[PDB]
Design a protein around this ligand. Structure first.
Ligand SMILES: C=C(C)CCOP(=O)(O)OP(=O)(O)O
Ligand SMILES: C=C(C)CCOP(=O)(O)OP(=O)(O)O
Ligand SMILES: [Mg+2]
Ligand SMILES: [Mg+2]
Lengths: 231, 231
């Protein structure tokens, strides 16, 4: 017997906020918290795979995060490179399929190369699908699908009055996966900050003051339970 | 001096849920609570106009609410007709601009005629803009703008690679108003249920267990205060 999605929850998306505050609370630089955040990513991926969750989607770098300090942005990119190298073989051994959603053109060659290669090694895996939203925005996401449909119309392949919700739905990120059931946002802010707008239309939303680097299995189970009791 | 938006809040959207439960808690039929909901709409519109809020957007009938019982749907439509007649002259006297957002084609002539006429009487008003989301869906909203852009492309007026966020932004409902600052959802459910997906990208989200027919000025002030303290 397989672990049937802990509490009926197939797809969880998480806004991993509070890294900066967590480090500052300790007198440390912001990047120290992002490093602590990665252990927290490791912990969440593990919990999801072990509890039958079909897909876990993590908000790692927003399309608005480029306005941050150039030096903070650089260390983020290098940390992502470092997480890919340190975790990939284990993701493959664990039957996890790795997908990065967002505009990867803006990334440096090294990072782009790591992503392409990590996705190709795990492309045929059938366990948990782990989606890392990097340089991602919900509006950007809708627009990419809208462009795929605009093109089709310029190719006389489609009529403007044929376009409807389900068609656009077939063109936004993760449409081939189960819909998002639960969005958990750590850090205490009560907003969704351009995360999966289209996809979260009927998703449960859970907010915790717990900061991302402190988010653990118990906190994840808590969210899951809140979802199971969503009566 | 004018009342500067109570706590810096220009545009509030409200998911008016809990009518059914509120009536049932009292042994009454569901429609009794929707009738009580309308007094609650009156109370919220009043509070918004008196506290300098620029726009108030109310979720009154979702595009998913047609699957409800035919008889419940009919009384809803008639109640909307009844609210238009009972409130319009007062909205005009109060300098409120009335806009209905959603697909009004699905409404019966009488209701469509009331809407068109109520909007034309108040079209030039300059105080609070009151948007009633009726037969509205956030996805539907994005798609209507996407169609306006598809058409333009079939008319060789636009190239698929020209379409971007701000352009689509200029084609979704309420783009000429201040963005949505705060979404309040009464009734206790923690989801946004297809409400303003595109527009709520950076909006504060507030959830209360209070049921819609019981929502009052004190509850509205509470939400406003929570927003002012959104640090
Ligand atoms: C997912 C990213 C890029 C950052 C998450 O934490 P923050 O760096 O936003 O730090 P806080 O100030 O919000 O606490
Ligand atoms: C805005 C509409 C159409 C209904 C709001 O309350 P409900 O009728 O959903 O009643 P509840 O069961 O949710 O309590
Ligand atoms: Mg943050
Ligand atoms: Mg309801």
């Amino acid at each position: 017997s397989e672990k049937l999605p802990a509490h009926g929850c197939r797809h969880v998306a998480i806004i991993m906020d509070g890294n900066g505050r967590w480090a500052k609370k300790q007198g440390k630089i912001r990047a120290f918290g992002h490093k602590a955040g990665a252990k927290s990513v490791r912990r969440a991926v593990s919990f999801a795979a072990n509890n039958g969750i079909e897909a876990l989607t993590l908000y790692a770098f927003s399309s608005e995060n480029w306005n941050r300090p150039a030096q903070e942005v650089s260390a983020l990119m290098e940390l992502f490179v470092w997480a890919l190298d340190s975790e990939v073989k284990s993701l493959h051994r664990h039957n996890v399929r790795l997908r990065i959603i967002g505009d990867t053109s803006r990334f440096n060659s090294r990072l782009q190369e790591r992503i392409r290669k990590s996705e190709a090694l795990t492309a045929g895996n059938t366990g948990l699908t782990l989606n890392i939203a990097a340089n991602y925005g919900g509006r950007w996401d809708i627009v990419q699908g809208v462009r795929q449909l605009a093109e089709k119309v310029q190719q006389g392949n489609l009529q403007p009055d044929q376009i409807d919700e389900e068609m656009l739905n077939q063109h936004v990120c993760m449409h081939e996966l189960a819909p998002v059931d639960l969005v958990i946002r750590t850090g205490g802010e009560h907003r969704i900050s351009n995360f999966l707008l289209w996809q979260i239309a009927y998703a449960e939303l859970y907010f915790t003051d717990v900061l991302w680097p402190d988010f653990d299995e118990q906190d994840f189970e808590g969210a899951l339970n809140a979802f199971a009791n969503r009566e």
